[PDB]
């Protein structure tokens, strides 16, 4: 159905992200602070949930 080395490219660009708990912003995986001004650049981050 799909090739795995092509799959990890799309997981890198689509779901391997960090989500801000305060403003739902999609951040890079090595993020400790959200880049949005409206949440006050908070450090309250979580990983993006992996699909099952």
């Amino acid at each position: 159905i799909i090739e795995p080395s092509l799959r990890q490219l799309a997981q890198k660009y689509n779901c391997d992200k960090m989500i801000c708990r305060k403003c739902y912003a999609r951040l890079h995986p090595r993020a400790v602070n959200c880049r949005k001004k409206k949440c006050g650049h908070t450090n309250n981050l979580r990983p993006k949930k992996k699909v099952k």
Binding site: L6, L9, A10, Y13, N14, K48, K50
Partner: protein, 190 residues
Amino acid sequence: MKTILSNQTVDIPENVDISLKGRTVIVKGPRGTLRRDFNHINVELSLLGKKKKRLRVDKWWGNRKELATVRTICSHVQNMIKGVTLGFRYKMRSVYAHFPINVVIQENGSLVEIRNFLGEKYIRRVRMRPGVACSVSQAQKDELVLEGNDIELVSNSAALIQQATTVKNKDIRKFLDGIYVSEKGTVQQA
């Protein structure tokens, strides 16, 4: 506090001829000419060294925000040297599950038509930036190759064609379809 002097340094190879008009850097070599204007940074650029082997960037009496812009210029000029000597090549794959992404090339690489993305009847026509040539490559199944001298224009065109194939109102973690940047490199090797 303001640091008295902050300087950084670009080592220019002998294949490259560089000249400056104030804060406007012109770079000429084997593949062409690149011009970048730096009148918004307010630094001192010096083309010292006989035969101009070395370029020096100075910030005098700068704060922490102003000292960050020095190696930014030293990276931009190195990117221009790299893109005039070796060039820039953005190899990028197209990932799909069911519908094959049909990619055709028009007007000698300046326009790219995308058909059958997620089974849609809409044709995505992507204009390319002036100076960037796009082509369907060989030896791989579904891969496009972008060619140029300017990393800004090449990567911005790659961002345009990547954001052209985006999935709307679906779970994008499941619908992992599009055209994604796989490898960033040069035209010829070093």
